[PDB]
């Protein structure tokens, strides 16, 4: 609402209230083609997301928790003293590309590319996902993961050469038998536009996610509440 840096003001202004979100994913995992649509709202003031996702092609062929990181970090809450480090909002409204490779230990990998940008007043995240080399009897295609999600801190670093950011981090998915399925993420983000962006000092994001079901919904779906806060600069 009041920042002495006009570049920060420009990005904050687009995220000042509740912003509607649309998520589209087209996926192919070991030749099972599927699509997911999601709708909800983001409130960057509190770092809060609320989304509901539907598999529009029938039953989702992989477990919903494996898609949480893939299915909008511009809604992170950056403390006032860290707002000059917020790459994600500084790239708006033209947006950014978010690319990942996700390696599931002892199993296959996801390769994702997403464009995150405004269409009018709506923040859209449009994703293509390709998954290969998964085991039919593994934890992913065998749906052995529990329907829950662990809190996680992720380290963000600038990539000055690409005018973007980079991160590598591990997600632990609980398996029904009490064990864990590791998912190693590599991520890079680059701006879509050619204007300047804020390139951050090293810092981390703290995330927490809660998964639930809509008791009146017959389609395969996931309801997601996420909180993300930046930290690590004193």
Numbering used by the authors: -5 to 65, 69 to 231
Kindly provide excerpts from the paper associated with this entry.
Reversibly switchable fluorescent proteins (RSFPs), such as rsEGFP2, can typically be converted between a fluorescent ON state and a non-fluorescent OFF state using specific photon wavelengths. In the fluorescent ON state, the chromophore is found as the anionic cis isomer, while the neutral trans isomer is responsible for the non-fluorescent OFF state. The motivation behind incorporation of chlorine in rsEGFP2 is therefore to obtain a construct with photoswitching capabilities that resemble those of rsEGFP248 but that can be investigated to confirm either HT or OBF.
Crystals were pre-illuminated with a 488 nm CW laser in order to photoaccumulate the OFF state. To obtain a ground-state room-temperature structure of the Cl-rsEGFP2 OFF state, dark data was collected in an interleaved manner (1:5 ratio) with the pump–probe data throughout our TR-SFX experiment. To account for pump laser scatter during sample delivery and to model a more accurate dark structure, a dataset was also collected with a negative pump delay (−5 ps). Minor populations of a twisted trans syn (named trans-TW) and of a cis anti species were also manually refined to occupancies of 12 and 14%, respectively, as well as the accompanying alternate conformations of residues H149 and V151. The trans-PL and trans-TW species we observe here have been previously reported in room-temperature crystal structures of rsEGFP244,52 and in cryostructures of Cl-rsEGFP248. In Cl-rsEGFP2, we observe the prevalent configuration to be trans-PL and presume that the transition from the planar to the twisted form is no longer energetically favorable due to the steric hindrance introduced by the bulk of the chlorine atom or to an electronic substituent effect. This is also in line with the finding that an enlargement of a chromophore pocket residue (V151L) can shift the OFF state equilibrium almost completely to trans-PL in non-chlorinated rsEGFP2.52 The states observed in our dark OFF-state structure are shown in Figure 3b. For the scope of this time-resolved study, we expect that any observed photoinduced species result from the trans-PL-to-cis reaction; since the starting population of trans-TW in our dark-state structure is below 15%, we expect that any photoproduct resulting from photoexcitation of this state will not be detectable in our data.
